[PDB]
Every structure is written in C-alpha cells, then in structure tokens.
Amino acid sequence: ATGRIVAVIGAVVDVQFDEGLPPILNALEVQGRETRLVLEVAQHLGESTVRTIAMDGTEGLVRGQKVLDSGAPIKIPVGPETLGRIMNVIGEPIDERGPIKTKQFAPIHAEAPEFMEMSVEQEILVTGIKVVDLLAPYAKGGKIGLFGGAGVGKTVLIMELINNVAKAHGGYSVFAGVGERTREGNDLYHEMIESGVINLKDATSKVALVYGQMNEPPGARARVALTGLTVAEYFRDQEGQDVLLFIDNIFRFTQAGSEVSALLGRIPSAVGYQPTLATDMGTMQERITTTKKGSITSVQAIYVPADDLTDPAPATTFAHLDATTVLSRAIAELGIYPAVDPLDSTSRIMDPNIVGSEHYDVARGVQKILQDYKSLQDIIAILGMDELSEEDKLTVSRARKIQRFLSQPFQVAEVFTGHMGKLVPLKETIKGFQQILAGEYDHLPEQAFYMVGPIEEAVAKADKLA
Amino acid sequence: AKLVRPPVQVYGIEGRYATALYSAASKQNKLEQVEKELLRVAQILKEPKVAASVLNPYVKRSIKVKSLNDITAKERFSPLTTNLINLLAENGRLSNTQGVVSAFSTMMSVHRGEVPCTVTSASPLEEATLSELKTVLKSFLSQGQVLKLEAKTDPSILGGMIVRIGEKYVDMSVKTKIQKLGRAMRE
C-alpha cells in the first residue's frame, strides 16, 4: 500500500492512503530519502488519513511524498548474532561492522506476558554495595529502579552494577541506552571491548547494546527502549536464558511521549504530560519481567525532574519496581557516595523469612536510628548539639557513624577519586553494621567510617588518624 | 419560525447549510429543481478555472461574491440557489460548497428512499444469484425503499457473504463461523 504525506509537524506526519489503510503500529517507509525514514502509525484520523510518529528527522519532507506500508510493525533482528553489536531503534547496526545476520526478526510491539506465566521466586542478588545489600537488597529476576536528580550518581551506580553483576553473570546481558549521552555509550562500548565482555573477533560476546540517545528525535527516544526489550525478550523466551537488562535512562521514554503528545492532538494532563502516561508506562514495563519461561533481572535508571519525586513520571514508575534505590542530592552534598537515601529506598525481599532475622534486624535498627536522627535534626539545627539528653547524643553519634559507613568507594569511581573500589560481601556488611549498632566503635571518630569497605578498614583508618 | 428537518441528518458547516436549503426548498416544495441546480453549480465550480479563481484568499471577498452572482445569474438559477450561493460567498464558506451539495445529495438519497447495501464476498458473485439476492433483500425494507447495492469483493472471508443494509448487518462469511468454532474449542 502507498500513501502520500499531507502534513508534517515536528516528529508527527499525516499520511493519506488511497487504498489499504495500514493498521495502527505498522511501520511505513518514506520514499525519496537518503537514509531509512520509518514512520510508526499511531492514530487513524478518518477520511483514509493516518497520523504517524517518525523514527528520524523529518527535515526535507514534502507534502505529497510517497510512503510505502511494510505490512508489519518495526521488526528488529533477534538472536545470538546481536550479541556484541550496537543497533539503533529500528534494528540497524551503528557499529560499522556490517549487517546483523540473524535468522529471525521480532516486532518491537508485543503483548505483555499473561498472569499464568508470572514467577514468584525471590532469591537475593548480592551486589557488593553496603547500603543496597543492607537496606534495600536486590532480587534475581526482579525489577530494580534507581531514582535520582541531575548529577547524583545514577550512571555511576548502574556502571558499578554492570561491573559487579554483569561480569560475574552466567547468562546474557542487554544495555538499552535511552536518551542519554552519546559519549557515555562510546565509553561503555570501548570499556566492554577492553574487558573482553564484547569480543570483536569471534562469537563469545555476552552483551547486546541498543542506543537511542539524547540527540535523537522523540520517536526514536520513545521506541528504543522497546527495541531493547525485544532483544531481551528473545533471549528470555526462545533461548530460556537468564538475562540482565540495564536501561539508562527510562524516564526519557515517558518524556519522549510527552514531546509528541501535543502534536498528536491530545488534551494535556498534569504538569503537561500525555494523558496516557500511566498506560504507556505499563504497556512498556509489563514486558520487562521474569516469566516461568526465563528470567530477566532489570536495572532501570529513572531521572527525577527538578529533584521532584512527586513528578508524574517517577511517581508512576514507583509501582513497577521490586527494589527502589532513591538517590538524594542532599546526601550527595554531604560527600556520602553512593547518595542512596536510606529512608527512601525499599525492597520487597526485605523480609525476615527471605533475608534472615539477623539481616532484617540489622537493617531495621539502622533505619530506626537514622529516623531518630532525622527527627532530632531540627533541635540540633537551632538549639545546637548541647541541648540534648545523653541518649539523644548517643543516637546522634551512632547515626552519624552509620551514615558515614553507608558510603563506599566504587571501582568505576577510582578514576576521579583515587580510592580503590570496594566490594563488600553481605555477611561483612551485616557484621559491621551490627557492631556499629551495638556500640563496639563508639570510641572511634566518625571520619574513620567514611569511604571504607568492611569495618576492619574503618578501624584501620581510625588507627591511622590517631 | 419553525424549520423543516430533513429525513437524514448531516452536521458541520456543510450539514447546517444543507439543512437550511432543504427546509427552504421543502417549504416551496421545489426539492428536485434545487437538487439539479446544486448539481449544476457543483459541476460549474468543480471546473478548475473557477475552482482556482473563487477559492483564492488573497483576492477580495466582494469581488468573488460579484463573480458568483454573475455565474449564478448567467446560468438561469432559481432565487433559492442564487441567494444560497450568495450566502455561501458572504460567510466565506465557498470551500464547503461541494460538501453542502454532497450533504444535500445524501438527504435526497434518503428522501427518495434509497438505502445503501454492501454485499462483501470472497469472489465475484453470479448474476442470477445476484438478482435473487437483490429480490430477497428487497424484503428487509419498508415501502418506498430501494437498494443501492455495491457488491464489493473481499477474498479474505473465504466464502459466504457479509450483507449490510443501512445499519442492519448479517455476517454469513465462513471465516466468522470458523473463528466462532475456534473460540468455542479454546473456551
């Protein structure tokens, strides 16, 4: 079927068909372009006219330009041949290594797994990060979301997780860069080549990369996450593999939809977002899941606009996650890194019957003492430290020591900090925090717990200060 | 004053002007004369020279009103259609002219008692079977009704026939039966 362009507004293109109106979500190819310009049908306008979202720039489009219907949605190559390669939103290679020669192509639009396919296994996933493993531990096959404002450490944390989990991972991995820095994608590509996780010479590569970055028009930024989902879903279903899916940044998805929502002719919702924010997010996120056919452990960095966690996009994302690591700018200005907010990060396996009564008690006691410190903060700020009781001063001192000991030097942060990274086992974390809560280190200064690994390094640093 | 509503309803600018003309003509019971005159003015304006001259926004409205007065008086038009075109040219809805005509036309299509009929089939049907089909479908209508049949062909129904008479609808395609059997076996 062939139609003709009748209107071009930004990323939105109206196409009028004389015969054979293409279904919604079909991919159309514009004729007369130097590169492949794909339009995805979004609405049927009536009078044999459809409204489409362009996957590339619409500059140079002329009213009346011919458009062919492919007969199917955007289909990307899926298989083990995509491992070690970089593809864009429409499945084309962008690594200059030639065609991705798979034996099967999958549409980026698919149905979410049914209710009878869901899994319930909730085994922990130790990450080596003290605050994560202690207070909001991740689960294998679960959904992890890293919230944070601009420049608080979402990319640093997700790169630390790639270093600590994906290399030690037995299955495959997919990194979907969505609306982020292109130089960050170049860094990740070359670092994965250096570390052997991507092999340019044989078929031993373990990661597939899908990049649509912040230089892309809103259609590509809205569908590149779906392309990454399709790759991970193939690896989960047809291969039965355990997949790792890193999405940085998923908020861009929502934001991209916002950018087109006005041009699609829809009445705006709260804060100018599309009225379909929650259902679009749900349609996308329900495919990011572990079924009883295969497992997908998902780590999604979630941008928080203007540091407002009540913004509709992060507020809607909160319900789709099994673990949330909420980074805070206030904690990042105290020098504590990672900037995890220990009273805002949660996990669903923080359950005595899952992590053990010892782990549960240490975590809950840490959170109790931090909440008590936060309650005292007002009086401490106005009436000074001296107007408290003895137990209040002891609580403040222990809470500050715990705040310091929650920080940790990362191996991805070695370059701009000099401090060698630390991977702290879960038992050593539980032991160190149990000991701090007990009072076994009430004599050491609080600066001794700042940016160390296990508690033995804390006592060594204490003996090195004095 | 009370207005006479046409048997069918059309909305928008075209529907409003067509309802106006239908009322104003049924009052003087001159419906067929204005029908043919609207077809005449439609054929006139559809000619590319006029369709380019009087559909031009950077020429004055009064000049195009005068040219429309010329083209409606010169072709011996009734006062009804004459001041109808004058009203269309005054309000600036000349671009909707054809639309109005279309609307008016379909109104008369149901004033004569012409009901649309679509008969979708997998193959071109047989002519004697088509005559029997028209005969039996005559029985789905009241008095003063006539099938306007358009037996378009869709080979994806694999057999049978899908009939739509106005808004009534029978789905005798075999594909519907097979999908019902599938849903019955799966549920």
């Binding site: - | 047989e126 089909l133 039996v136 005798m172 097979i178 799966r186």
Partner: protein, 39 residues
C-alpha cells in the same frame, strides 16, 4: 501428564484450525436461503 495433555490439546486445536482452512456455490445458496428466513 497434565502438561502433556494441555500441550497436545493446544496443538490439536492449532492443527484442526489450520487444516479446515485449506478445505462451493451451495454455501451462497444456503446463505441466501437463510437471509430469506430473516423475517
């Protein structure tokens, strides 16, 4: 046993559906006759 029954029955449904599609003016005759009985 239950899983085998379920998957075998699902493939039976799929096969019967695919294979009845492969398999007449009597169809149109009966269709016109039933449209005559539409009252």
């Amino acid at each position: 046993q239950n899983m085998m029954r379920r998957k075998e029955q699902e493939h039976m449904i799929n096969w019967v559906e695919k294979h009845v599609v492969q398999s007449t003016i009597a169809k149109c005759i009966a269709d016109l006759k039933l449209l005559a009985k539409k009252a």
